[PDB]
Amino acid sequence: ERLWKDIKRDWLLYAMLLPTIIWFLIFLYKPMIGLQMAFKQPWIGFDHFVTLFQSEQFIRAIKNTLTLSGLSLLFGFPMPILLALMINEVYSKGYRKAVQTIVYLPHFISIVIVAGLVVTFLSPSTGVVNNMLSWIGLDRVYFLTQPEWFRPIYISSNIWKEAGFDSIVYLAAIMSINPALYESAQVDGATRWQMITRITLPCIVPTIAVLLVIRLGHILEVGFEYIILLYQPTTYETADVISTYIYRLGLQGARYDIATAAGIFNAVVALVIVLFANHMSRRITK
Amino acid sequence: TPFYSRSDRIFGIVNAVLLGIFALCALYPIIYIFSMSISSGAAVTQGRVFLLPVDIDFSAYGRVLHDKLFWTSYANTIFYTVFGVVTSLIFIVPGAYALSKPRIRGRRVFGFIIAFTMWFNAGMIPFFLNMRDLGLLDNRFGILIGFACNAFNIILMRNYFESISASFEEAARMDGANDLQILWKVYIPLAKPALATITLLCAISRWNGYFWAMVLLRAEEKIPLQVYLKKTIVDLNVNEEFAGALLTNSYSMETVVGAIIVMSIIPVIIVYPVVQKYFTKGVM
Amino acid sequence: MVASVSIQNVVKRYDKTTVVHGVSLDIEPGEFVVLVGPSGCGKSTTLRMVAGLEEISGGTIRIDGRVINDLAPKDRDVAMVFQNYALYPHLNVRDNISFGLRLKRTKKSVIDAAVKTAADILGLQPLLERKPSDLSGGQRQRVAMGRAIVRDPKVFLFDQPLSNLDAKLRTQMRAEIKRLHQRLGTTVIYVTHDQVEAMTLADRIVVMRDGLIEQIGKPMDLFLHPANTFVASFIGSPPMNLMPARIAVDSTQHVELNGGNRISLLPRAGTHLAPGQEVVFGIRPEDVTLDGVEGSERAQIKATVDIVEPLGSESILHATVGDHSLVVKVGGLNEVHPGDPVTLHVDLTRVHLFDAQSQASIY
Amino acid sequence: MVASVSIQNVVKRYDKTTVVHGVSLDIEPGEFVVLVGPSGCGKSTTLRMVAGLEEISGGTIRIDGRVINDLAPKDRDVAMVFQNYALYPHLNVRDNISFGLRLKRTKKSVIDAAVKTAADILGLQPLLERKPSDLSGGQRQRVAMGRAIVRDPKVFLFDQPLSNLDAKLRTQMRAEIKRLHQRLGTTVIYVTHDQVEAMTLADRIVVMRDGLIEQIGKPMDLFLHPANTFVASFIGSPPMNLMPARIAVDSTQHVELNGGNRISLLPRAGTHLAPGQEVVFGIRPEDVTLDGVEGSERAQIKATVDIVEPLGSESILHATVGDHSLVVKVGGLNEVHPGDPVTLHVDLTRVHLFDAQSQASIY
């Protein structure tokens, strides 16, 4: 009919789409078949769920998961927006350029190198951080062993590395606003703080909303590769997160079914929380 | 542009200072280890550095330079980055080109297929298991074809294609050019900006890629840097060989670590200007 | 080469959305015909259907004896000049023109004779080896034309070619196009949203509103005798004065409008006007004068001046009668001190009347 | 309210790039003055300097007695209507207009009274609670104007306001602007790249090429007596016919051009031109007629027809003399079958002569 007619016209174009479709089927959707692993082996199943329901090590990981998700949203997410505003207000040209190169750069530093930077900085009697404390008489602290310090060390290292590169997007958004909106406001005698509150931010809101529902999409997996590297036995309590718990059991511990199932519980909620995100985003913000 | 009010001028200055302060905090660790790597083991071990190198001696670098695994693993990433990108490009660039033209029947459903993978994933273990029975474990090509297509890199590529006026394709068709030869002759050199942001994101993804590499790989000779970097840099437990080397050398563990990560980030610090040089050419 | 294209009941359908309603047009060989109208009309859609860039949802169209409905754009013996810069910015100008022909034939095709002509035509001797990156929009559109004319088609296709060009450029390219058709003479169909380009270039003008086809005829036919109030309001340098009026006392003699004003009417045979009939009274600004040099008596209207805009040796007068205002174009540079009353003199032969319901040309 | 702005030797410097060259202009209170010229000129830059959006690199400018050079845009008693949509797309129309006044608030009654006025002027009452997202570009520019007039400044500033609007809209807004100045009367400075808007709206026109200031005067002064060949070519509906010519045998009597043609000249005292002097002979298309000027007493130009473009009740004639072609605007259609010779008749009073070196107005 219609179909067959185009399929000859676009055949070469229709060709290109296939390997990409083949790939996604094989490496993404085909593993989705393995989701039936909710039955160890020979099916069932749904029990280890209630076993995964009850663990004193697990129930704290999820308790730690959404906890870490809170602080990441609190401190981590708004910071690149802040950085974007702070850069936009910079005159002097190249000076602003200099700031951008410096601040953006840590993004390209590997996460495992970042971790290494942390362990070498926070090492007792060796690490420069402890040394600087001994200078002013703050004594010394072993940071990686203390569960108290784990999260502050993380989110601070995360905003060092990623908050600059994330600021590019917001910075690029506020650069897309026609100056007429700003110039006419200056004519009415607006102030820099008045502007960023009454025009800049409101104009950028559609951007920060979209980025938020993406941020919420991964909100349960936050800090996976960082934690898995640096988390000590003593900090196991606060540091362990569902994604980590899954890894330890899934790959290290070689327990698949209970993990894959715990994988589902993480995946569904993530798919849930992004739906509750997207709704309230599109609805209220445009 | 025009300066003026005090409520600005003061605000403007304290902004540049605060941002400057933040900027120094961000540049600090980079200049630190650069100095610390050059410094001497005894110096770093107690009170010194904090900014500048101290007793030099340059001895930590000699260790890593004769490390074969280091240079072995470095080679693996260069392999993985170069070929991994190309495999991604070949799977994405034409794939999005097809996805761009809305004469396709599947345009509705094929888009859903790809995009659905964004907000829902099979999970950690099922991906690994599918890697297992596909026989791709401990295999370099398994790493390459394992991660090539990203949903984001596709819809971004299709959008730039869609962004281009169809008049180019139309003009080509009027002259007789059909599809793929349109893609390579006109749409691709038109797509250079989209091509940039893609080949870049895939690049760094390969270079700094760690997890799935160390999980899917067994043979040490296939290990891609950051995996090998994990062992030495964070875990920080070493052979007696290196322990024996500590006393006969006068560099330190920390100084070696410093030198290692320096040699690790230089090519990264390298592509960054390339990256920067890249985006502001006026790109749509 | 010189060919005739016939379009019969051609209709394009998107989803359920019957975009063009079966417009039918027959085009003489060597004829310059212009499609013109407002936006969101099938002017382009029709042209594109001719080119083969869009499918025919019904009806047939053919060039000479060849039915091109199921044909391919390559084999349709047509060439198209698009609205936005159809030239590839990487290739050089010489390579851009010759592009279609280097796909196949080389060495016996020569290509040099053909490019020589086209180069000679738009005068691009110094520009042969140049690149679109360092060319003017007009030059870009010129070489784009070179692409078409090097193909040597039966029909030329133009989709709003000068639309993206500046005004100063439009008047130059417009002369060059008319001049070009005198030189070459190939059949050409032309699409514009601009009334001006239609009146100038076209042998015949066909106006299309919202998918339908409003009228066909020589430039002066549409100007002198518009089919409806739309055709009347569209063409002409200013808009024609469309205000409502009535008949009352007698029919073929007097027509009165809201300004407590009354106009005697020329008899005109074939008129059949009804006494009392709701009507709109059209008149062109050039067909309206001031107090009257000559005249006079029963040929005029009384008004009070709103504003006067001096342009050239001419001037645009805005005068207010009733609840509505009419615009008259007066010759000169005198004094029209706004706010005082004024008498305008209407030309009796050029008046036009349209029914209020049946929006078409009664008088 | 109604105030005078004086601009004295104002110069703007970017890097080393002295953009405007010390343009000086004095503006009467309540006067409508239009800056006009090609692109890349300081027309906008001057305007922006008045507003205070750009710094004054030299010279002084002042409104009334106030020197505003070091002042702030807020305190400059000015309002500006920008080229692209200066309205915030989130706020409603009512909030957009009142925006500047709600910065310091001070009452919701004071601002409420002001919007009532401005809404009534432009007919923005039903659109009060609407949003820029669902408004027409003209309506968007209308409410943008409301923003300015609600400030009640001493001076109105316009930077190419109608530039982004369509042609049909330009003619409507242009009438509305002139009409508005009659109603209000506040001093206004106006910037355009379009010659048309300048001639219509302005009490005085000042033309600026490449940072300098070319001429100042009433619309008809620049039209009747251009300072140079540029001012001559810029203004007027078509361009004035600028082709080169000479003097030879005698001076104040005859002028001959490349077409083996010779034109007798009116004496025009104080001219004192030299025989043989290199010159360019200007004439306007409206000032040239056909052979119908009955037998040609003064022995007028001879020509051959290139092309004829019918527009309205008028027609654009392209005729070719020597190596150059001149354009004449003829009322009619007639038989002008291109390719045959034709006789054109020049108006002797409206001729203009310019020296080849000193590009300025000899005759």
Phi–psi pair at C269, nearest 5 degrees: -85, 150
In angstroms, the CA D190 to CA D34 distance is 4
**Among B71, B226, B88, which Cα is nearest to B144's?**
B88
Rounded to the nearest angstrom, the minimum Cα separation between B189 and chain A is: 18
Tally Cβ neighbours within 10 Å of residue A43: 9
* CB-defined contacts A:B, below 8 A: 255
Please state, in angstroms and as integers, the Cα–Cα distance from residue C79 to each residue in B252, C65, C179, following that order.
76, 18, 19
Pairing of the two strands C241-246 and C254-257: antiparallel
Q: Which residues, at least 6 apart from B14, have a Cβ–Cβ distance to it below 8 Å?
A: none
Q: Where are the domains of chain A?
A: 41-286
What CATH homologous superfamily does C1-239 map to?
Answer: P-loop containing nucleotide triphosphate hydrolases (3.40.50.300)
How far apart are the C-alpha atoms of C201 and C294, rounded to whole Å?
35
B1 and chain D in contact, CB less than 8 A: yes
Rounded Cα–Cα distance for residues D170 and D192 (Å) = 12
Contact residues for C202 (Cβ-Cβ < 8 A; gap 6+): C32, C33, C34, C190, C219
**Longest Cα–Cα distance in chain C:** 82
Resolution of the entry in angstroms: 4.5
B33 CB neighbour count, 10 Å cutoff = 26
Token representation of residue D363: 């005759």
Between CA D244 and CA B235 the distance in angstroms is: 88
Structure tokens at C95: 């390579």
Domain C301-345 has CATH 2.40.50.140: yes
Side-chain-side CA neighbours of D303 within 13 Å: the count stands at 27
What CATH number is associated with residue B137?
1.10.3720.10
- D85 to chain A: which residues are within 8 Å by CB? 178, 180
Element housing D102 (H / E): helix D99-102
Residue A258 sits at φ, ψ, to 5 deg, of -70, -25
User: What tokens does C239 get?
Assistant: 């808009």
Single-letter amino acid code for the residue at B120: F
Backbone phi, then psi, for C293, in 5-degree steps?
A: -70, -65
DSSP string, B53-115: --S---HHHHHHHT-HHHHHHHHHHHHHHHHHHHHHHHHHHHHHHHHHSTT-STHHHHHHHHH
> Residue A198 has what DSSP assignment?
I
b/e for A266-282, b at 16 or more Cβ within 10 A?
bbebbeebbeebbeebe
d(CA A55, CA D167): 74
In terms of Cα–Cα distance, which of B268, B215, B277 is closest to B78?
A: B268
CA–CA dist A242, A263 (Å, integer): 8
Number of CB pairs < 8 Å for B and D? 12
Pure H helices in chain C: 43-51, 93-97, 99-102, 112-122, 137-149, 167-183, 195-201, 219-224, 229-234
B178 contacts in chain C (CB < 8 Å): none
Nearest to B25 by CA among D206, A69, C227, A156: A156
Q: Tell me how close the Cα of D169 comes to any Cα of chain C, in angstroms.
A: 12
What are the beta bridge partners of residue A131?
none
Alpha carbon distance, N-terminus to C-terminus of chain B: 26
B256 contacts: CB under 8 Å, gap ≥ 6: B60, B63, B64
Chain C interface residues (partner D, CB cutoff 8 A): 167, 171, 174-175, 178-179, 182, 194, 196, 199-201, 219-220, 223, 236-238, 284, 286-287, 306-307, 309-314, 316, 318, 333, 338
Backbone discontinuities in chain A, residue before each (C to N > 2.5 A): 41
Contact list, B29 vs chain A (CB under 8 Å): 117, 121, 160
Candidates B121, C119, C347; CA nearest to A263 is B121
Rounded alpha-carbon distances, angstroms, from residue B276 to A165, A249, B19, B279: 12, 41, 20, 6
Query: How many CA within 13 A on the CB side of residue B1?
Result: 14
Q: Which chains lie within 8 Å of chain A at 3 or more CB pairs, if any?
A: B, D
Q: Which amino acid is at C326?
A: L
- Type of residue found at B157: M
User: Can C1-239 and C240-286+347-363 be said to share one CATH topology?
Assistant: no
Residue by residue, DSSP assigns C222-277 as HHHS-SBHHHHHHSSSS--EEEEEE-TT-SSSEEEETTTEEEE----TT--PPTT-
Give the separation between CA C134 and CA C136, rounded to whole angstroms: 7
Residues 6+ apart with CB under 8 A from C363: C265, C268, C271, C273, C351, C352, C353, C354
For chain D, the residues whose C-beta falls within 8 A of a C-beta of chain C are 167, 171, 174-175, 178-179, 182, 194, 196, 199-201, 219-220, 223, 236-238, 284, 286-287, 306-307, 309-314, 316, 318, 333, 338
Q: Is C312 in Cβ contact with D219 (below 8 Å)? A: no
| DSSP classification of residue A26 | I
CB D165 within 8 A of CB D192: no
For the structural domain made of A41-286, what CATH number should be given?
1.10.3720.10
Calpha distance A182→D133 (Å, rounded): 19
- Joined together, the tokens standing for residue B215 give 């999980």
- The Cβ-side half-sphere exposure at A139, using a 13 Å CA radius, reads 3
**Cα–Cα distance, C87 to C95 (Å, whole number):** 10
Buried b (16+ CB within 10 A) or exposed e, C262-298: bbebeeeeeeebeeebebbbbbbbbbbbbeeeeeeee
- Of C309, C314, C358, C301, give the one whose Cα is nearest residue C338: C309
- The DSSP H or E segment spanning B214 is helix B211-216
Q: Number of A to D CB contacts under 8 A, please give it.
A: 46
Which chain B residues are within 8 Å of C83, Cβ to Cβ? 167
Cβ count within 10 A of residue D224: 13
* CB-count burial class (<10 Å; 0-12, 13-18, 19+) for C141: buried
Q: For residue D223, what are the CA distances in angstroms to C250, D195, D350?
A: 49, 11, 11
Q: Which of B8, D90, B18 is nearest to A82 (CA)?
A: B18
Identify the H or E element spanning C192.
strand C187-192
| Dist CA A125 CA B47 (whole Å) | 9
Characterize C84-109 residue by residue with b for buried, 16 or more Cβ atoms within 10 angstroms of its Cβ, and e for exposed.
bbbbbeebbbbebbbbbbeeeeeeee
- Is the CB of B5 less than 8 angstroms away from the CB of D72? yes
Rounded Cα–Cα distance for residues D175 and A41 (Å) = 85
> What is the H or E stretch that residue D309 is in?
strand D302-310
Long-range CB pairs of B179-188, under 8 A, 24+ apart, other chains included? B179/A10, B179/A11, B179/A12, B179/A13, B180/A12, B180/A13, B180/A15, B180/A16, B180/B94, B183/A16, B183/B94, B183/B97, B185/C88, B186/C88, B186/C90, B187/B97, B187/B161, B188/B93
Single out the residue of C103, C98, C79 nearest to residue C88, CA to CA: C98
Beta-ladder partners of C215: C207
Touching chains, D (3+ CB pairs < 8 A): A, B, C
Question: In this complex, do A99 and B19 lie within 8 Å of one another by their Cβ atoms?
Answer: yes
Nearest CA-CA partner of C308 in C338, C284, C287, C283: C338
Residue (of C6, C9, C356, C52) closest to C213 by Cα position: C9
Alpha helices in chain A (DSSP H): 2-9, 11-23, 30-33, 47-53, 58-71, 78-88, 94-104, 111-122, 128-136, 150-161, 163-174, 179-187, 192-195, 201-217, 224-230, 236-239, 242-247, 257-284
Q: Is the peptide bond before B163 cis (omega within 30 degrees of 0)?
A: no
Partners of C319 in the beta sheet? C305, C326
Q: How many CA atoms lie within 13 A of C308 on its CB side?
A: 20
Check if C84 contacts B (Cβ < 8 Å): yes
Cβ proximity of B174 and C80 under 8 Å: yes
C-alpha B49/C-alpha B250 separation (Å) is 16
The rounded distance, in Å, linking the Cα atoms of D51 and A180 is 13
Contacts of B210 in chain A (CB under 8 A): 110-112, 225
Whether C273 and C353 have beta carbons less than 8 Å apart is answered as yes
Q: Which residues of B touch A95 (CB under 8 A)?
A: 16
Contact C351, C282 (CB under 8 A): yes
Cβ neighbours, 10 Å, residue D7: 20
- Say how far apart CA D51 and CA D63 lie, in whole Å: 11
Task: Verify whether the Cβ–Cβ distance D220 to C286 is below 8 Å.
Answer: no
Strand partners, D328: D317
Instruction: Count the residues in chain A.
Output: 286
D79/A202 CB distance under 8 A: no
D137-149 and D167-183 helices, crossing angle to 10°:
20
The answer to whether residues B196 and C97 touch, using CB atoms and an 8 Å cutoff, is no
Q: What is the dihedral of CA D266, D272, D276, D281, to 10 degrees?
A: -50
Contacts of D257 (CB under 8 A, 6+ apart): D243, D244, D245, D246, D263, D281, D301, D321, D322
B229 contacts A113? CB cut-off 8 A: yes
Q: Angle, to 10 degrees, between the axis of helix A111-122 and the axis of helix B253-279?
A: 140
- Structural domain boundaries in chain D: 1-239, 240-286+347-363, 301-345
Q: What separation in angstroms does the CA of A209 have from each of A175, A281, A286?
A: 17, 6, 9
Q: Are C308 and C325 in contact (CB under 8 A)?
A: no
Nearest to D303 by CA among D334, D329, D340, D342: D342
What phi, psi does D189 have (nearest 5°)?
Answer: -115, 130
Nearest Cα residue in chain B from A121: B29
The amino acid occupying position B66 is: H
C23 vs C21: CA distance, rounded Å: 6
Mutate to test the interface with B, among C49, C68, C80 (most CBs of B within 10 A): C80
Query: What sign for the dihedral angle of Cα B116, B117, B119, B122?
Result: positive
CB C284 within 8 A of CB C242: no
Which residues from A are below 8 Å from B49, CB to CB?
Answer: 128
Nearest-CA distance from C200 to chain D in Å?
A: 5
Q: Which two tokens stand for residue B167?
A: 């008049």
Structure tokens at A225: 């590769």
Going across the sheet that includes D241-246, the strands are D261-264, D254-257, D241-246, D279-283, D352-355
Best to test chain D binding among B1, B4, B7, B8 (most D CBs inside 10 Å): B4
CATH architecture of D240-286+347-363: Beta Barrel (2.40)
Write phi, then psi, for D232 (nearest 5 degrees): -65, -45
User: In Å, what is the CA distance from B220 to each residue of B68, B70, B260, C38?
Assistant: 11, 11, 18, 70
Dist CA A56 CA C58 (whole Å)? 72
User: Do the strands D187-192 and D155-159 form a parallel or antiparallel pair, or are they unpaired?
Assistant: parallel
**Inter-chain CB proximity D309 and C182 less than 8 Å:** no
Q: Integer distance in angstroms from the first to the last C-alpha of chain D?
A: 43
| Amino acid letter, C143 | V
**φ, ψ of residue A246 in degrees (nearest 5):** -55, -50
Q: Is-contact A75 A159, C-beta < 8 A?
A: yes
Instruction: Please check whether residue D74 is in contact with residue A188, taking contact to mean a CB–CB distance below 8 angstroms.
Output: yes
SS3 string, C14-41, reads CCCCEEEEEEEEEECCCCEEEEECCCCC
What φ, ψ does residue C63 adopt, rounded to 5°? -105, 125
Burial class (CB in 10 A: 0-12, 13-18, 19+), B103: exposed
Q: Does C163 touch chain B (CB under 8 A)?
A: no
Whether the link from the prior residue into A45 is cis, omega within 30° of 0, is yes
At residue D255, the 3 state secondary structure works out as strand
- Residues C256, A48: Cα–Cα separation, whole Å: 93
Nearest to A223 by CA among A104, A105, A75, A123: A75
CB B129 within 8 A of CB A37: yes
DSSP string across D159-218: ESTTTTS-HHHHHHHHHHHHHHHHHS--EEEEEES-HHHHHHH-SEEEE-STTS--EEE-
